[PDB]
Ligand binder design. Structure first.
Ligand SMILES: CS(=O)(=O)Nc1cccc2cccnc12
Ligand SMILES: [Zn+2]
Ligand SMILES: [Zn+2]
Ligand SMILES: [Zn+2]
Lengths: 159, 159, 160
């Protein structure tokens, strides 16, 4: 009964010239996300929520851009290593929920694929992983298509 | 002991010539929220948190903003149907918390009425529902009064 | 008990000249500081609102008035301690807190551990039940331009 909650946030700029990768899914679009490696805003937010629930710090403390051990690691590899550390710290993951905020493109066709990737990386039943997606109603840098945000929540239990 | 957490976010533009309906409360104001439904940003955020905790997707999956049957829809009726589907999936709701962020109007006089509406719609006592209200401290489109944001968290248990 | 409850909090403060930068109780060298009551500690405000939310006690604005003589000179750690007292008064025990600070500058990583220790002391929690995370906003929006700093928090409590 030693439950803990975690929460996560990430945002990346959206400009022409890079692929759009969210939840491990490459999505055709005239723009993509800027950042180190694949810039997968959804997996980053979930990773931070899991480290947070385990009180293990954050994604930057575990996976430095300088560290050679993770030099060529994509965000799914980081999520799997996060899950390994959360387990070794004594915690079992109970569920993950999340939201992607992007004015475009439409993400609904890709939700099942993202959920499948996340559930595989976390070794969770599919019904314990949820991804939601919406626009920002044309408000702000998100509403103008200048970036994409992700939010995540995770529940774990100390075993 | 099969607890799950969900999180929700929503934003809508503030425009002339629309009712301002937040938490089910019609608030006297010269502007209202723009949306396909009644645009109740707080109830939408809570709806998303509940679908998310149950791994049932999101509000756009269940109540599409392109379906004419939801034009002008009462978001309390949508929230009640969400709660019915969460129950049908096997979950009982344990608590909801939420935040509304707006430059104006003052929401303190209306918070208790919003809490009572949500509690009624979710078949919860008042002591399991919370609504918080604040400004965005003058920053961004929220500081400029261009829209209103809501955030929500929900805890459920699979019975 | 098995009567768990979750709360969520959000706050943002403007960065202004002539004030110290205090986040999580830590004074951080910087040319600007946060605008608000006393030390304007945006992280402690977000945690405070998450704790009130988890206990269904409302929010900061309903608990802490500018006119209350008990709190006129109170800093954000005194208010966080008072929040925790009111959570306990309502019959709840805190199980864990997690949080994120979004600041484009300065670097917060050297200060995280001290923030965690401050929060744990104020909430009477062991360090392993308190977490603080730090992020930039990738140069987007008012956060990315350095006009303010945001904090987010989540709290789990149980009705004892
Ligand atoms: C700008 S401040 O530092 O004074 N903080 C606040 C002032 C006024 C109301 C608030 C409500 C929640 C969080 N912070 C609040
Ligand atoms: Zn990222
Ligand atoms: Zn909406
Ligand atoms: Zn504040």
């Amino acid at each position: 009964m030693d439950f803990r909650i975690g929460q996560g946030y990430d945002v990346h700029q959206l400009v022409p010239g890079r692929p759009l990768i969210i939840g491990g899914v490459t999505i055709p679009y005239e723009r993509g996300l800027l950042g180190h490696s694949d810039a997968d805003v959804l997996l980053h937010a979930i990773t931070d929520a899991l480290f947070g629930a385990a009180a293990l710090g954050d994604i930057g403390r575990h996976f430095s851009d300088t560290d050679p051990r993770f030099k060529g690691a994509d965000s799914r590899a980081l999520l799997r290593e996060c899950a390994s550390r959360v387990a070794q710290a004594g915690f079992a993951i109970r569920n993950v929920d999340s939201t992607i905020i992007a004015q475009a493109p439409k993400l609904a066709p890709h939700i099942d694929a993202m959920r499948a990737n996340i559930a595989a990386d976390l070794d969770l039943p599919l019904d314990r992983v949820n991804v939601k997606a919406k626009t920002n109603e044309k408000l702000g840098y998100l509403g103008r298509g200048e970036g994409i945000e992700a939010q995540a929540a995770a529940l774990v239990v100390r075993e």
